[PDB]
Design a protein around this ligand. Structure first.
Ligand SMILES: *[C@@H]1O[C@H](CO)[C@@H](O[C@@H]2O[C@H](CO)[C@@H](O)[C@H](O)[C@H]2NC(C)=O)[C@H](O)[C@H]1NC(C)=O
Ligand SMILES: *[C@H]1O[C@H](CO)[C@@H](O[C@@H]2O[C@H](CO)[C@@H](O)[C@H](O)[C@H]2NC(C)=O)[C@H](O)[C@H]1NC(C)=O
Ligand SMILES: *[C@@H]1O[C@H](CO)[C@@H](O)[C@H](O)[C@H]1NC(C)=O
Ligand SMILES: *[C@@H]1O[C@H](CO)[C@@H](O)[C@H](O)[C@H]1NC(C)=O
Ligand SMILES: *[C@@H]1O[C@H](CO)[C@@H](O)[C@H](O)[C@H]1NC(C)=O
Ligand SMILES: *[C@@H]1O[C@H](CO)[C@@H](O)[C@H](O)[C@H]1NC(C)=O
Ligand SMILES: *[C@@H]1O[C@H](CO)[C@@H](O)[C@H](O)[C@H]1NC(C)=O
Ligand SMILES: *[C@@H]1O[C@H](CO)[C@@H](O)[C@H](O)[C@H]1NC(C)=O
Ligand SMILES: *[C@@H]1O[C@H](CO)[C@@H](O)[C@H](O)[C@H]1NC(C)=O
Lengths: 175, 319, 288, 49, 195
């Protein structure tokens, strides 16, 4: 038996791929196969060792590359979607010059700043990516905008002294 | 709605390489379905953007709580409480929680974190109280709340003097009304009604879908790994081919279903955005646009995958 | 195809692939043309001036018992055969400078002993060669891609008039197929042919009498890769991007355009691979 | 591939028949001895020897 | 207005971003049609993609089966296109209603609704034709400058308190005058401006 490593497993002509770790749930003397709510087996009993192993699938994920734009630069940041940052290491790109673990996946190729700017290249769960801080794609926390509190009082009012006329264009498809 | 992206390659063929080759024969159906889901995923984030990003700059709630006899403790965010969610807002996640990858399916997180949504709602609330409708049309202008309310009465045809003459009576009714609302949300098992169904319907499709993989679809086995081991490629194809055809059907139904659902949500988002722009920023002349009766103002609220609007309306009691 | 971007999963030299340079230049007592391993990607790029590298050898073991390939680059044609040839340990092409007449003649064409049978014989299209006996920088360039697919031997070529670059020139040029031969030969490795520049100053024998001089050739292997190839209006492949090599590059294939705007694009799924296969069949020893 | 999967409750059968009806003993297809002596299921799994 | 209109001309010539909302629709429709057209190439489990080639090298009964397979594969392709097209058509239809609404409502009359047309108060609107779309230019009034003033709801003169007929009471701090809430015009308070 091997544990904590994704390995192909075959039990009595049943084959699945996952990491097998001991599962806390206690099963009955007669029960053999444990299954989840989605009708996928989540547990097994070692036939030879009579022990309970929990089966979970080997983390997949979609890869998205964040580009400032081809014209501006060639630098890229790749955010694996959902996968843990420790996970795995195109071979050169693997190690993360700036590996940073976010909440939306595991960014690799950007440097997490402390400052907050307007959104530029949206990512997920707050984090945004910008090509502007010699140059490097940086992922900020996306604070919503300048925080100013209008000065308030029961006896205080503000009335405009000048006005500006402006033109704004809204574009809607008709056919 | 929850951003759901399903990888056409992994679901249909599964882990096995041999199963993948047949999928290549089919074409860009695999590729096309993923694109449609991603479009849907962007809409749910983008929808959110339209509905809540109505303000250029977040306005901090004024430290002074003087409200001209109006108590806003339920509506406004609490600093002491974690996550900056209002009593109404803090509790709703309570309520929602009470009401409420793994496989082939990744549920992507939204662009705007629930925390960020909370800030947007606060800004509108802060904007409405401090600056009236001035913030909607430009730089927010500080105004007395009593005075703001005075303008509101004028719009609905009740003279401002009327508000000022019995501000105390009005303030108490408003305060009492807000308290009633807090109790009503908690006391009712099922007031949210419509919001609940959106979540339940989406969940049913996924289960049905998740349940769909198990179905045989006129094949000897329901498992790609199982079928592949038992059968050789040469005569394998007849069963391997079909399961693929059947499963493709499941995806298309689900993908098509999502688009219709997304379209419905988009209209709701745009309607909801309209109310947010149309009712929160300024008084709406249209009758029965905001709640029932004459409308004075509305306060935006945030729930998971939804927006709850509190409408303040004037009704004539006695004749 | 005109003005269309197409992606074809056909073996290609990986971009920025490592290339093993070779030297066939005496500049002291230096001469090397040993056997090289051959895979699908047998890309040969010789650089010559006075035309010192001429031919090639293909085969499995060169035992004269397994069917094998062989060529001469004469002024007439790139002459080819499939024959069970018995090659010597040090084959070459020999040219001598005669005092009575200024012309370079073959002195010892003992490249092979005899041919057992031919299942294919062949002569290519006519062309001409300069055959100069001087010293100089390699004004010209020759590239070839030898490939073996589905029972067919194939070759591709281009002449590039590059000037004064030791390394392979920066730029984009596309090889044009020259010949297709249908052959069943399986060939593990290949060798190159040199032209020995025999003169009066040399000792005057087959073991030590030679002043070969400068020569240079580079071999790069070929592995299955997907190339997005840009097609010009005329149809010359003006530019190509390799999708497999880079994260940026992979985005372009999904995007199906040479230029990409700023944004986030999802290109490919990522999956882990199980470290070991574990089988836990019943432990019982008794056999049915 | 019968080597690499674990079955459940293997059954063996045995009898003597004429040489012609060996093709007749197959799942689904009809026959005299197949209708009077031994009728296989339409989706029988196993190997006939 | 002239400077304002001038900027818009410059903005339009300098970038494709204005038509991105419209153009996305143009590109997305074009891409959908292109995929389906390409579909023709896909085998869909058949011996060969080109329909004529299959018919030429196959005898009728076999040809029958392969034809059916192609049709099923091709029927599905068509279904997706029509189904996709309808959703997009419905989406475009909504814009046209909105498109038609913006065409008439901003253009004919003035809309009191805040932010429905442009940002801020909408004085008037003009529409410019675009390929497969309508572009609306919105003129809006936005108040640029604000001066702080102390204010009070009612003024007591004889034990009776007046209120402004149309404007909030605004005082610099020396005297009390009434000005329109949106522009600062100070008028000496009188019976005419009060009740
Ligand atoms: C109101 O704002 C306008 C526009 O900014 C002002 O007009 C400018 O005034 C400055 C200073 O007198 C001039 O140099 C500019 O040429 C004017 N035009 C612009 C566009 O700046 C105006 O002065 C401001 N105040 C009013 C009318 O009270
Ligand atoms: C060329 O001649 C060689 C040597 O005679 C042939 O090799 C023999 O082929 C026969 C028939 O296939 C085999 O049984 C022998 O074992 C082979 N070796 C010898 C020494 O006879 C070869 O087949 C002939 N033809 C070619 C290569 O085309
Ligand atoms: C990633 O795995 C490491 C293992 O030490 C763990 O500490 C961390 O909490 C994990 N995070 C996620 C999101 O899996
Ligand atoms: C009005 O309020 C502030 C209060 O500090 C005052 O100093 C200034 O004149 C105005 N500025 C604002 C609202 O920022
Ligand atoms: C508002 O009501 C809360 C709830 O009890 C109370 O604690 C607070 O003092 C009140 N504040 C007002 C009227 O400003
Ligand atoms: C090429 O080989 C050299 C040997 O010095 C090595 O330094 C380099 O890393 C190699 N590069 C690649 C891409 O194989
Ligand atoms: C090709 O020749 C090699 C020599 O190493 C041999 O191992 C291999 O079996 C041969 N393959 C074929 C298809 O002839
Ligand atoms: C490509 O076609 C153009 C037609 O204007 C011609 O000028 C040019 O020489 C052609 N180039 C090649 C490489 O065929
Ligand atoms: C109101 O105050 C301003 C600022 O001090 C002053 O310019 C104006 O003259 C005042 N009103 C009168 C009538 O003086």
């Amino acid at each position: 038996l091997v544990k904590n490593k994704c390995v192909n497993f075959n039990f009595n002509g049943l084959t699945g791929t996952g990491v097998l770790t001991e599962s806390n749930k206690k099963f009955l003397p007669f029960q053999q196969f444990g299954r989840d709510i989605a009708d996928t087996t989540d547990a097994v009993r070692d036939p030879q060792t009579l022990e309970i192993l929990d089966i979970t699938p080997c983390s997949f994920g979609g890869v998205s590359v964040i580009t400032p734009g081809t014209n501006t630069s060639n630098q890229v940041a790749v955010l694996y979607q959902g996968v843990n940052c420790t996970e795995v290491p195109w071979r050169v790109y693997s190690t993360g010059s700036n590996v940073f673990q976010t909440r939306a996946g595991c960014l690799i190729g950007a440097e997490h700043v402390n400052n907050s700017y307007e959104c530029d290249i949206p990512i997920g769960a707050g984090i945004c990516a910008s090509y502007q801080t010699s140059q490097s794609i940086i992922a900020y926390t996306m604070s919503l905008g300048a925080e100013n509190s209008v000065a308030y009082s029961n006896n205080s009012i503000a009335i405009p002294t000048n006005f500006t006329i402006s033109v704004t264009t809204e574009i809607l498809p008709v056919s | 709605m929850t951003k759901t992206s399903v990888d056409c390659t992994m679901y249909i063929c599964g882990d096995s390489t041999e199963c993948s080759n047949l999928l290549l024969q089919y074409g860009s159906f695999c590729t096309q379905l993923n694109r449609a889901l991603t479009g849907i995923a962007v809409e749910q984030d983008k929808n959110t953007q339209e509905v809540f990003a109505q303000v250029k700059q977040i306005y901090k709630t004024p430290p002074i709580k003087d409200f001209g006899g109006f108590n806003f403790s339920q509506i406004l965010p609490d600093p002491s409480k974690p996550s900056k969610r209002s009593f109404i807002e803090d509790l709703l996640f309570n309520k929602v929680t009470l009401a409420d990858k793994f496989n082939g399916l990744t549920v992507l997180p939204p662009l705007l974190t629930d925390e960020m949504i909370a800030q947007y709602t606060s800004a509108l609330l802060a904007g409405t109280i401090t600056s009236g409708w001035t913030f909607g049309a430009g730089a927010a202008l500080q105004i007395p709340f009593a005075m703001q309310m005075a303008y509101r009465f004028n719009g609905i045809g009740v003279t401002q003097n009327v508000l000022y003459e019995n501000q105390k009576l009005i303030a108490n009714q408003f305060n009492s009304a807000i308290g009633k609302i807090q109790d009503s949300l908690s006391s009712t098992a099922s007031a949210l009604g419509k919001l609940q169904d959106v979540v339940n319907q989406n969940a049913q499709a996924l289960n049905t879908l998740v349940k769909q993989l198990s179905s045989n679809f006129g094949a000897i086995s329901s498992v790609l790994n199982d079928i592949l081991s038992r059968l050789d490629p040469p005569e394998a194809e007849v069963q391997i081919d079909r399961l693929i055809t059947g499963r493709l059907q499941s995806l298309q139904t689900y993908v098509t279903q999502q688009l219709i659902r997304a379209a419905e949500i988009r209209a709701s988002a745009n309607l909801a955005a309209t109310k947010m722009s149309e009712c929160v920023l300024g008084q709406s002349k249209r009758v029965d646009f905001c709640g029932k009766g004459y409308h004075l103002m509305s306060f935006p609220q945030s729930a998971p995958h939804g927006v709850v609007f509190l409408h303040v309306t004037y009704v004539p009691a006695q004749e | 195809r005109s003005s269309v971007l197409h992606s074809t999963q056909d073996l290609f030299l990986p971009f920025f692939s490592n290339v093993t340079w070779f030297h066939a230049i005496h500049v002291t007592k230096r001469f090397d043309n040993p056997v090289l391993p051959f895979n699908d990607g047998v890309y040969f790029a010789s650089t010559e001036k006075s035309n010192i590298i001429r031919g090639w050898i293909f085969g499995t073991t060169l035992d004269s018992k397994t069917q094998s390939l062989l060529i001469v680059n004469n002024a007439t044609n790139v002459v080819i055969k499939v024959c069970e040839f018995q090659f010597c340990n040090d084959p070459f092409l020999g040219v001598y400078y005669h005092k009575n007449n200024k012309s370079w003649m073959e002195s010892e064409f003992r490249v092979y002993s005899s041919a057992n049978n031919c299942t294919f014989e062949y002569v290519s299209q006519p062309f001409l060669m300069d055959l100069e006996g001087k010293q100089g920088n390699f004004k010209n360039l020759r590239e070839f891609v030898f490939k073996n697919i589905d029972g067919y031997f194939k070759i591709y070529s281009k002449h590039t008039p590059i000037n004064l670059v030791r390394d392979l020139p920066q730029g984009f040029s596309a090889l044009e197929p020259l010949v297709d031969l249908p052959i069943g030969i399986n060939i593990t490795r290949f060798q190159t042919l040199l032209a020995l520049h025999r003169s009066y100053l040399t000792p005057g024998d087959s073991s030590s009498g030679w002043t070969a001089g400068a020569a240079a050739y580079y071999v790069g292997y070929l592995q299955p890769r997907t190339f997005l190839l840009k097609y010009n209006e005329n149809g010359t492949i003006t530019d190509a991007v390799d999708c497999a090599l880079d994260p940026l590059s992979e985005t372009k294939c999904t995007l199906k355009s040479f230029t990409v705007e700023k944004g986030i694009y999802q290109t490919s799924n990522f999956r882990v691979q199980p470290t070991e296969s574990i089988v836990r069949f019943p432990n019982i020893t008794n056999l049915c | 591939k019968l080597n690499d999967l674990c079955f459940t409750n293997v059954y063996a059968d045995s009898f003597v028949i004429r040489g012609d009806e060996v093709r007749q003993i197959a799942p689904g297809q009809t026959g005299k001895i197949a209708d009077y002596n031994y009728k296989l299921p339409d989706d029988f799994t196993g190997c006939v020897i | 207005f002239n400077s304002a209109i001038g900027k818009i001309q410059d903005s339009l010539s300098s970038t494709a971003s204005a038509l991105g909302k419209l153009q996305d629709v143009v590109n997305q429709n074009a891409q959908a049609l292109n995929t389906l057209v390409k579909q023709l190439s896909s085998n869909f489990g058949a011996i060969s993609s080109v329909l004529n080639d299959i018919l030429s090298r196959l005898d009728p009964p076999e040809a029958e089966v392969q034809i059916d397979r192609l049709i099923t594969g091709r029927l599905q392709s068509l279904q997706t296109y029509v189904t996709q097209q309808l959703i997009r058509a419905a989406e475009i239809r909504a814009s046209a209603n909105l498109a038609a609404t913006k065409m008439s409502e901003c253009v004919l009359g003035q809309s009191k609704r805040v932010d429905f047309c442009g940002k801020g108060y909408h004085l008037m609107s003009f529409p410019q034709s675009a390929p497969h779309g309508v572009v609306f230019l919105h003129v809006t009034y936005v108040p640029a400058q604000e001066k702080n003033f102390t204010t009070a709801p009612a003024i007591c003169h004889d034990g009776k308190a007046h209120f402004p007929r149309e404007g909030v009471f605004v005082s610099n701090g020396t005297h009390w005058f009434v000005t329109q809430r949106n522009f600062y015009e100070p008028q000496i308070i009188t019976t005419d401006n009060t009740f």
